[model samples]
Target: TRFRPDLLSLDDLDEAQLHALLTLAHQLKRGERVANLHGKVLGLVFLKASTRTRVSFTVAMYQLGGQVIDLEPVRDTARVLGRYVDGLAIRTFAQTELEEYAHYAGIPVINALTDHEHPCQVVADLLTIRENFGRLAGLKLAYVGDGNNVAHSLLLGCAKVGMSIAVATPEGFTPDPAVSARASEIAGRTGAEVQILRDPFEAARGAHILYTDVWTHRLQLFEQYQINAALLNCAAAEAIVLHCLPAHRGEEITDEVMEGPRSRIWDEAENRLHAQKAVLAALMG
Candidate 1:
């Protein structure tokens, strides 16, 4: 089969493909080099700001024996890059724009980030969870904070992997209704429970992974949603914490918890390289 998977979302992948990606990521992290995409080139467009996403994909292409060209204001549409490169990796605010690129581009299109979802981040997060816990199925991951792109991806990812997920966001901060509904549907088939709650403590209870993101420095959410030692105590004893980085120390999470022994934020960040390597190798290698 052609290694040209269009990874727009975890929803685009079946259970087998999802596991295959994670397994490949693990293998690649253990000093395995496929160099399957030798001489291939990937087109990377970042209309939004980035750190991990940018560096990881660049390094991923490099490790795979491929080259990466950062695309700027193009002469035409995103599809035009397919003529110059083997694949397109995009990071932008508009989900529809990414969809348009995938629709018109002849080669595979990867969603590096979008306002609607952050699939690449979730891949690394899931890999971190699996690496720390030894399994994904039957684990519980609780997200506390804004129900943004990261939460959307995590909901889909956890459900597809048979891990229950509970999201706690303030009233109006709940995840997109459609995303929640679709995750519930997937959960039905996979036996994963999906819950959305307003109380962070409730969500954290019994969770194996306690996750959070920046709330944009909103005063109303600061105290109620911050992931601190107290909140972490509500989770399972062996539970680990995760943050997507660029964290506001006293905002979304406390400094102590961030630097605490239970924090896997650094590993999570590093896994981005391995995860995207697997993605590039699988799609273009």
Candidate 2:
């Protein structure tokens, strides 16, 4: 199968489909995934209201010739949200609610993000990684921060695409065990390694990509995991860095490293416009 009609998770896609999504994302970035627009529209629904992280859902459709949106409720009231658009993308609190919406919506449902996994973001992140290294299969990506939504997605995404992934977070901040298990099962088949560690530096060792996500209050817990220059020096010389952005600066990453030549942050951000389109197109086209 190329991809599930609903991308509720990266696991919704098989390895073949994962490669298809990235290749199509690259094609769009290099040009083309938009010209066809498929004319159609894609919709969005949100639960959180700040414009900080869950911001742009419509930027690409315009380039693809437009029609991205937001429609919502005391609902994932599918038959309702799915009623008007070609496909639906949602960002909300629980994975269970989104899954319910996917079940209720006869049309495809794209998981824009959730407390569980940020799959759409990973789609772009993977594209960014591929652009930097010219490939992904043999690369090692070290995620040195919270084992939150982003980390969970990286675990599944990297394994699906055949890249080894190591996640290093404080003992209390690890990813869900079940999520890790799924990623490991996929990794075994793809020849990717999924390791969870309590030390960030060890995870970064010889890694081809260094990544991190947002951090919360617990100052003492995050103090040692900071992705500063001294820490990144431990990664492969040619390795690049990535942050999901709306960065915490000196917290999970240093301002200097986020702006450094090895940082692919901007390219990663730009790919956001291209990557989702490919997956949305794959499902909608």
Candidate 3:
């Protein structure tokens, strides 16, 4: 379980494994030119919704001399088509669907993302953090927003590398109970401090990384106003704001934060493409 259990969360990795992947990811990010994996094909099964997850995987596959078949699992038949692919990248309704696809597919199954965890993005986040700070251990990260997939992944990432993390979430809006419980347990083992707070400023206080995500879940357009009102004050001036983008603009995150100097979001996003290439190499090689 110390290795990538399902490529579904960073909590699945130990410190050495996390650093190893970051090393590989850093190469992909900084390489003067691309390398192998020619003529490979990756199947992307999106059962829910996405922007960065889908784009990053698609481009990464192509950049590595591979091709991608974007399939809408809900609209199309993912479980059925899983039979035809070399590797499966699934962003599904649940991690269970990803597990099922892996079980039936007889190929390397990578979790593109899910509602519970975003292992890929967390890999990218780690790459960004390592690049900027030269290390990940004991760095303080504060996440103020919905404790959705991204936040959950960050918690796991922090735990994996013994980083101190605080999450501030609105009432009735928090990470999945099972995921949170497991992360807390891992934090205990790794000497990483993890806390769920109600006050955003408390979470952001003296934090090196300030992370946020879309307050609204996919296909829930009506929840926009609530998310906008809830997560606006999640960061301080000294902290760098990170968002996995296709942001709702004035909602979930604001224009100021998105454009702010401390915003490492663009770098974070660029890391997605590079990080996933490392993922493909690790899983497929």
- Return the TM-score for each candidate structure: 0.95, 0.93, 0.84
lDDT of each: 0.88, 0.83, 0.73
Candidate 1 Cα deviation (angstroms), residue 164:
0.7
RMSD of each: 1.9, 2.0, 4.5
**What tens-digit string does per-residue lDDT give for candidate 2 at 1-285?**
466788888888888888888888788768653555555777777777635333455766666665876665434578876677788878888999998888888888888889999888899999988878888897999998789998999999999989999999998999999999999999999899999999999999989999988885588988888888987889998989898878888798888999898889988888777887787677877
What lDDT score is found at residue 73 in candidate 3?
Answer: 46
TM-score of 2: 0.93
- lDDT (10s digit) by residue, model 3, range 48-90: 6676678889888887888888774432454466556677788
The full ranking of all candidates by lDDT, starting with the best, is 1, 2, 3
lDDT by residue for model 1 (32-104), tens: 5454788799888889767678899999888888888887333357657778899888998888888878887
Q: Pick the candidate with the highest lDDT.
A: 1
Best by TM-score: 1
